[PDB]
Design a protein around this ligand. Sequence first.
Ligand SMILES: CCCn1c(C2CCN(C)CC2)nc(-c2ccc(Cl)c(Cl)c2)c1-c1ccnc(NC2CC2)n1
Length: 344
Amino acid sequence: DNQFYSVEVGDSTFTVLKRYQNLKPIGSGAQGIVCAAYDAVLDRNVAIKKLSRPFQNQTHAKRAYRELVLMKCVNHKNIISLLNVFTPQKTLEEFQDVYLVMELMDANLCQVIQMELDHERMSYLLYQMLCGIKHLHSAGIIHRDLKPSNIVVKSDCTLKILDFGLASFMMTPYVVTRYYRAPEVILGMGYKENVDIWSVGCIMGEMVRHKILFPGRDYIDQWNKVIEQLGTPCPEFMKKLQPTVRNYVENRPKYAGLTFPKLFPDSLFPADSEHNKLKASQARDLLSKMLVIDPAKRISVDDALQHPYINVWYDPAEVEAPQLDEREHTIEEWKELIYKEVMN
Ligand SMILES: CCCn1c(C2CCN(C)CC2)nc(-c2ccc(Cl)c(Cl)c2)c1-c1ccnc(NC2CC2)n1
């Protein structure tokens, strides 16, 4: 008379509470498998993610624990919130998997980037990313790794950021996507709240150009794509660099960089009406303020929410609302740390 039941999804097995029915695979990754399902108790559709032995290594462990803890430090409609969390295993000894449940979303941002969007939807999406990021910043959480695959949306244009960002080695078959990381993350320097504004601009630019702005096999290639388009950083920016890195970037070919009208031509923006012509100008303006290599001169979250392109959606109720853990542990220690959290 178990509260759970098991289902075969891929070469994987999902053991979930009986309230969740008609599971259907919708996504996978190096941290877990996601399924769509009907929650008969809430009479609502939901997404369920399985973390298989998240304590298996430090990488998986730190992330799972941080996110389990963080999800409690945040309360915002543009940030993921759990509906349920559970484990089919009855004791710590037997503990293996953690199931996370949230509201079923319709698509990720990669899909949205593939489409042509009016200014109303693009700015509304951007406005939401900003409200979420602002909320995280208010809770002392600087993300540093925002990316489209981790952002989901619904048909009504509503948006949720799914993870909490950065805090080593793993043997996963697939690498990490770094195309949206700021210069400061890429060059390992100090950083502030607006490190996330660079990521918002890589996304916004991609929604326009429909192509990853700064691709590359690694940080070497990536940095080359950054300077070839925006140009070599100002001399002062360099003084903020470690002598070694600084040597490397200071000794890199000096690029003039392109103007934003060239980087994002009018052809990419809908110029069939005065309204669309004005909005295109305002969008390019925001891009030029967000894609700024030197964090000292890059617009902040609050000022971006005040930019004309974004400001039309401003709402005090949405812009303002509002434990310590650090070190590393052994597998065993992590297993218990996560179990406790799961059992609350
Ligand atoms: C394609 C599915 C998108 N998605 C992802 C992915 C994030 C990036 N990695 C690499 C792969 C999985 N994680 C969750 C997710 C994250 C946290 C929790 Cl607690 C739960 Cl249940 C689900 C959801 C999602 C969530 C809701 N709706 C959807 N579906 C939209 C694409 C259909 N996906």
